């Protein structure tokens, strides 16, 4: 029971960290286009990442 | 003369206050279809619905941007990105742009005046001032531009934050 609990906790923490770091990378990549006045994200980028 | 009059007229409607502890600290600008506000200073915007909305802040670029409420669209500011070398207008005296650098003669700026927009010959905004670095009898201005779609920071050595 200790081994299965530890393995489950490790897997959950790994997937959580990976998802959080990926979404942080997305936010960092798409941040500068929202700051430029006017302008518009490329449709390819707007498809590969959900661009408002 | 009349140019200063029109600059004051547009400034009385575009730039907004930032308030803290009985003292004004910073100025926010309404550029194009977004709101610029340098993120380094912290305070309450002297407005009702401007401070009620949600912002997007970047510390790498030291700024924060917002989307206009639909009821202030007409109070635009006619953004632009062309930057010919030469003279430009500013609320505290004309600036000189040369060699990719912004220069002001000695200390024409006050410490805490970060956020003043700069207007071109036609009155369109080009850059927002962030800081300054004094050398000799001149001061180089660290500002941000809007070349194409990316925002570029230019900062000289020894720049002190305003």
Curated annotation (Swiss-Prot), chain B:
Active-site residues, record numbering mapped to chain: 40 (charge relay system), 62 (charge relay system), 114 (charge relay system)
Annotated region (Ribosome-binding), positions in chain: 1-14
Residue ranges of domain Peptidase S3 in the record: 14-162
Subcellular locations according to the entry: Virion; Host cytoplasm; Host cell membrane; Host nucleus
Spans annotated as Dimerization of the capsid protein: 84-94, 120-124
Domain-level remarks: The N-terminus contains a nuclear localization signal and a CRM1-mediated nuclear export signal. The C-terminus functions as a protease during translation to cleave itself from the translating structural polyprotein.
Self-association state and partner proteins as the record states: Homodimer. Homomultimer. Interacts with host karyopherin KPNA4; this interaction allows the nuclear import of the viral capsid protein. Interacts with spike glycoprotein E2. Interacts with host IRAK1; the interaction leads to inhibition of IRAK1-dependent signaling.
Name of the protein in question: Capsid protein
Protein source organism: Semliki forest virus
Residues of the full protein shown: 106 to 267 of 1253
